[PDB]
């Protein structure tokens, strides 16, 4: 019900001490000394770094000093590294079984730039080429807006039919991704030497191919 109230962001330089917090509800942070700090990396589920007010297990280092004063529980990641860019959050018990978990703090090492990965091109399969079909496609993976476009070529010129291009949304790294496909039969693929695909994405516009020609 209760959300454990965390500072929304906190920043430190490399070689500085970063502190984070967590304000409870009786039955959790204040009740017991069982306050639990975690570290999540955008791709998977959270790891364990601190529980029980400065009680840590194995693998995790000397640097992590987390505890509680008042009902503001604290975590201090001193002498920080480029490794520590992650989603850190507080937790605590309630009694019997239940527990309340935090609203998150984003830790930053100071200053930030841009990044890009892949848009390929693929044919059909021989599972469909068998009982008449050639369904090709065009993949526009990963970006951060939810606004990309697509269009194709077939021997270099504008095509107009049978292509279903549809709109992008979020992944497990919380970046959006896109879909497209065009449908012909064996014969129309067999007549055609090329199928080039052109995506765009906010001025970063593309006429793509990894392909070093098409031949044999």
């Amino acid at each position: 019900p209760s959300a454990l109230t965390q500072p929304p962001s906190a920043s430190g330089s490399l070689g500085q001490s970063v502190t984070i917090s967590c304000t409870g509800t009786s039955s959790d942070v204040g009740g017991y000394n069982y306050v639990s700090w975690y570290q999540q990396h955008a791709g998977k589920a959270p790891k364990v770094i601190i529980y029980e007010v400065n009680k840590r297990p194995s693998g995790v280092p000397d640097r992590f000093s987390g505890s509680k004063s008042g009902n503001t529980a604290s975590l201090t990641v001193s002498g920080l590294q480029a490794e520590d860019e992650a989603d850190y959050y507080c937790s605590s018990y309630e009694g019997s079984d239940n527990f309340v978990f935090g609203t998150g703090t984003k830790v930053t090492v100071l200053g930030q730039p841009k990044a890009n990965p892949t848009v390929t091109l693929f044919p059909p399969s021989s599972e469909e080429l068998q009982a008449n079909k050639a369904t090709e496609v065009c993949l526009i993976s990963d970006f951060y807006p939810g606004a990309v476009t697509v269009a194709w070529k077939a021997d270099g010129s504008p095509v107009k039919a049978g292509v279903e291009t549809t709109k992008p949304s979020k992944q497990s790294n919380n970046k959006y991704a896109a879909s497209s496909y065009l449908s012909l039969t064996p014969e129309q693929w067999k007549s055609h030497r090329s199928y080039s695909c052109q995506v765009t994405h906010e001025g970063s516009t593309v006429e793509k191919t990894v392909a070093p020609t098409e031949c044999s």
Binding site: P1, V48, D97, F122, K167, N173, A177
Partner: protein
């Protein structure tokens, strides 16, 4: 290994009933040992907890879903239960079967609670096929990725489903259209690329589409040629046999096949006794193609060529054995002793000028007496002022050995001179 996987899905419209469930295979609990959770994520928002249960005896549900929820278990059958009664407009979320350790870390697959009827239609495929431009160390990553489906889980299998070494089945998407797209990479050795067949091989049973595709890398090779003199004692001797030779080097091991063309004059000789040979040099070959010459033809101002054609060469490297035009010259062969300030040194050195010459068909040498000497450097000549050529020759010896009275002889074997050799001679 542990699995948690959910059922009960569909799209329905508020003021009636739906019953979701989750079964597990490869770790014990359900309720007995630890606890269980159920989450919800609205389309555009993130994760919110909906309930909790213990060992068997305390189920506490969320203030949104409090008094409302029922999060129950079936311990002996190892299955979970979410029977609920009134999922309104906003409650349509990504519900997932969340086992607990110490907080909520093993992720299920989940099954979508959605709102009013729905369809089920098609995927297809994408293979991340690798960039030759190198990343650091013995790292190489290629892939596969699957596009535009309706219902989710898929079976993206690598090299029919085997080679789950350096594989990262990269996570999915649920688009703004409502569609899907995920990846699957192969992070194995860089050398093991080209050397082996890798196949991306998908399957989708919600509709019926299956697939398969491959890989390759790149690096260095593209050859060099040269053409060479007959010996002047072979050409001046009526009884000894001259010849022009075409060395082709840096051939490769992926493109051996070196063909030659031979023009004695403009008219193809074709043959004569032109003999190549391809032998295993360092990691390429050395090919020695070999013309037979009757003395006179050289001496009667003949033009020669070797048009080397290998496939690794788009365009055939021709080379003319071409002599040059002329000034007379016969080298101005004058060897020289030191600057006296080298008898204050354990080691002296000796000179040998050969200036004033045309052609650059030079062959200088040195000696100690009847036998040769090892330490010498000879300049490969500069086109002089009065339109000639010139060079300098070394012999790096000892002062101690010099004042012993050693007879160093700078043997020269250059051209408009007497014995197609002249030797200037030096000592102290």
């Amino acid at each position: 290994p542990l699995v948690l996987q959910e059922s009960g899905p569909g799209l329905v419209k508020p003021s009636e009933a739906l019953s979701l469930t989750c079964t597990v295979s490869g770790d014990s609990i359900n309720t007995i040992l630890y606890y269980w959770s159920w989450i919800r994520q609205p389309p555009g928002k993130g994760l919110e907890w909906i309930g909790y249960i213990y060992y068997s005896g305390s189920t506490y549900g969320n203030p949104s879903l409090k008094s409302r929820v029922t999060i129950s278990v079936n311990t002996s059958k190892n299955q979970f239960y979410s029977k609920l009664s009134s999922v309104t407009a906003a409650d349509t979320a990504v519900y997932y079967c969340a086992r607990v350790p110490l907080v909520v870390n093993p992720w299920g697959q989940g099954t979508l609670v959605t709102v009013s009827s729905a369809s089920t239609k098609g995927p297809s495929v994408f293979p991340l096929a690798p960039s030759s431009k190198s990343t650091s160390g013995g790292t190489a990553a290629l892939g596969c990725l699957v596009k535009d489906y309706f219902p989710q889980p898929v079976t993206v299998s690598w090299n029919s489903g085997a080679l789950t070494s350096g594989v990262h089945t990269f996570p999915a998407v649920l688009q703004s259209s409502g569609l899907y797209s995920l990846s699957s990479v192969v992070t194995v050795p860089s050398s093991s690329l080209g050397t082996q067949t890798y196949i991306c091989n998908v399957n989708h049973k919600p509709s019926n589409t299956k697939v398969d595709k491959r890989v390759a890398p790149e690096l260095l090779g593209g050859p060099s040629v040269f053409l060479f003199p007959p010996k002047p004692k072979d050409t001046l001797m009526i009884s000894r046999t001259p010849e022009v030779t075409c060395v082709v080097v840096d051939v490769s091991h992926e493109d051996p096949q070196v063909k030659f063309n031979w023009y004695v004059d403009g008219v193809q000789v074709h043959n004569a006794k032109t003999k190549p040979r391809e032998q295993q040099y360092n990691s390429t070959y050395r090919v020695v193609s070999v013309l037979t010459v009757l003395h006179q033809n050289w001496l009667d101002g003949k033009e020669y060529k070797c048009k080397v054609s290998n496939k690794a060469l788009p365009a055939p490297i021709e080379k003319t054995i071409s002599k040059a035009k002329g000034q007379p010259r016969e080298p101005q062969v004058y060897t020289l002793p030191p600057s006296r300030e080298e008898m204050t040194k354990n080691q002296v050195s000796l000179t040998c000028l050969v200036k004033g010459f045309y052609p650059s068909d030079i062959a200088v040498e040195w000696e100690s007496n009847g036998q040769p000497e090892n330490n010498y450097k000879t300049t490969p000549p500069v086109l002089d002022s009065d339109g000639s050529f010139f060079l300098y020759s070394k012999l790096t010896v000892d002062k101690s050995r010099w004042q012993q009275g050693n007879v160093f002889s700078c043997s020269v074997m250059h051209e408009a001179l007497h014995n197609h050799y002249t030797q200037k001679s030096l000592s102290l």
